[PDB]
Design a protein around this ligand. Structure first.
Ligand code: HEM
Length: 185
């Protein structure tokens, strides 16, 4: 895992739960880095899993909801760091169907040591998209938060249903349906 994921996450923990919680989940965790990360650094995901599990136990917020909130926050990091890559797309469904064969291809050029999930499109229309998410890190809700903000970026919204094919969240079917445009709301 790249260090930018660690630094932005602990920034969000400090922003939402306080600096003492940042020190707490770091103290409860070991952690070859010992809690010191750099943006271009490469660290084991087991470090992040410890940080998430300890934060969830301390705050009583599920890892699902913590990763969802973080995934939504990380879209703003994408907005401010790669606006040209984001400006390539004009439709949220087309962008999400382009994560595997374009977006994360560019990410591997940024970070050659990147450890990324796989997204496989099984069905796609103009307002629907079904993809299979596969990753040993089971960060489906991190991707869900990024998907939520992808639709928000294009002034849209979507119902996104997650079906865990493997119970540990390492294979998840995403059923994305752009919402009814309630034009008379
Ligand atoms: C242009 C926009 C995007 C940029 C710049 C980007 C860059 C990354 C980076 C840097 C990482 C961390 C890699 C590592 O730690 O080695 C990453 C991991 C991830 N990204 Fe992308 N990403 C982008 C669009 C998406 C979108 C839209 C989704 C939602 C489906 C997405 C779902 C993920 C997930 C779920 C992970 C966690 C790793 C895993 O699941 O195994 N990304 N991305």
């Amino acid at each position: 895992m790249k260090g930018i994921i660690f630094t932005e996450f602990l920034d969000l923990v400090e922003d939402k739960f306080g600096l003492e919680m940042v020190d707490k989940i770091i103290t409860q965790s070991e952690l070859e880095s010992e809690g010191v990360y750099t943006s271009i650094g490469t660290y084991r995901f087991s470090e992040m899993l410890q940080l998430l599990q300890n934060l969830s136990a301390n705050t009583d917020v599920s890892i699902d909801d913590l990763l969802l909130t973080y995934g939504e926050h990380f879209f703003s990091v994408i907005e401010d760091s790669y606006p040209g890559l984001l400006a390539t797309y004009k439709d949220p469904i087309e962008m999400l169907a382009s994560i595997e064969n374009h977006i994360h291809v560019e990410v591997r050029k940024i970070y050659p040591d990147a450890e990324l999930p796989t997204f496989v499109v099984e069905e796609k229309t103009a307002n629907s998209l079904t993809m299979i998410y596969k990753s040993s890190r089971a960060m489906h809700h991190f991707g869900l938060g990024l998907m939520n903000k992808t639709f928000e970026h294009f002034n849209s919204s979507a119902e996104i249903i997650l079906e865990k094919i493997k119970e540990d969240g390492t294979e998840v079917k995403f059923i994305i349906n752009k919402n009814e445009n309630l034009y008379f709301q």
